[PDB]
Amino acid sequence: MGSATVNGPHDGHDPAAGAELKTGKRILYWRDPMVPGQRFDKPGKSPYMDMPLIPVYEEENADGAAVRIDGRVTQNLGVRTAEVKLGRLGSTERLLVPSEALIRTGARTIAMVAKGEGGFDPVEVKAGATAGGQSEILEGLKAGQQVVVSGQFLIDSEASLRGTVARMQETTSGLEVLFQ
Ligand SMILES: [Ag+]
Q1: What gap in Å lies between CA 96 and CA 170, rounded to an integer?
Q2: Of the four listed, 19, 85, 148, 162, which is most buried by Cβ atoms within 10 Å?
Q3: What string of H, E and C letters represents the secondary structure of 133-157?
Q4: What are the Heavy metal binding domain coordinates in residue numbering (predicted)?
Q5: May I ask the CATH architecture of the domain 81-160?
Q6: From ligand 1's centre to the CA of 56, what distance in Å?
Q7: 120 and 148 in contact (C-beta within 8 Å)?
């Protein structure tokens, strides 16, 4: 048949999230072909009939069977994010995020955090540096949380690989011993 994913991201692509199966054709929910226009919270048997619901486009994988997210898609489609994580060593450890991720106002910063529950929430954060096309979250948020950045990356697989096939604390690499 072919792979109908020949196109990639468009302009305005902040390289924080390429969305690998968080959009496009990944299980969003279940529907009965006799109940189109509905929105079931999750798979199961139809309440209107007694048949197992039919899955959308991809049909029964998406989160790799709980490997990924808890089968919830915290992806508002037109809104991408970037996860909080420390991006320096030796330098002064700060939470690195895309410069457009945070809200600058007055003499402080706000972050609309991507909460794991599939929602977005505003947080007052300390943010005042810029480094390498990114900004520094001095204080405010924690690693493992995300912020809204509305940009796309080329291949999101690298990022996706964290948390699915890869686990471990700090999730770092090429850092066995650090003395000198
Ligand atoms: Ag039916």
Answers
A1: 15
A2: 148
A3: CEEEEEECCCECEEEECCCCCCCCH
A4: 29-56
A5: Beta Barrel (2.40)
A6: 15
A7: yes
Phi, psi of 16 (to 5 degrees): -110, -30
Q: Tell which residue, 168, 124, 169, 119, has the closest CA to residue 146.
A: 119
CB atoms within 10 A of CB 50: 7
Q: How far is the CA of 51 from the centre of ligand 1 (A)?
A: 6
**In angstroms, rounded to a whole number, what is the distance separating the alpha carbons of residues 171 and 60?**
28
* Residue 83 to residue 145: CA distance in whole angstroms: 5
Instruction: Give the domain ranges of the chain.
Output: 81-160
Alpha-carbon distance of 97 to 86, in angstroms, equals 9
Task: Report how far apart, in Å, the C-alpha atoms of 156 and of each of 18, 20, 29 are.
Answer: 4, 5, 22
160: nearest Cα among 30, 63, 33, 28: 63
Closest CA to 109 of 127, 121, 130, 136: 127
- Cβ–Cβ under 8 Å, residues 81 and 98: no
Distance of CA 20 to the CA centre of its chain: 9
Experimental method: NMR
Question: For the chain, how many residues are written?
Answer: 180
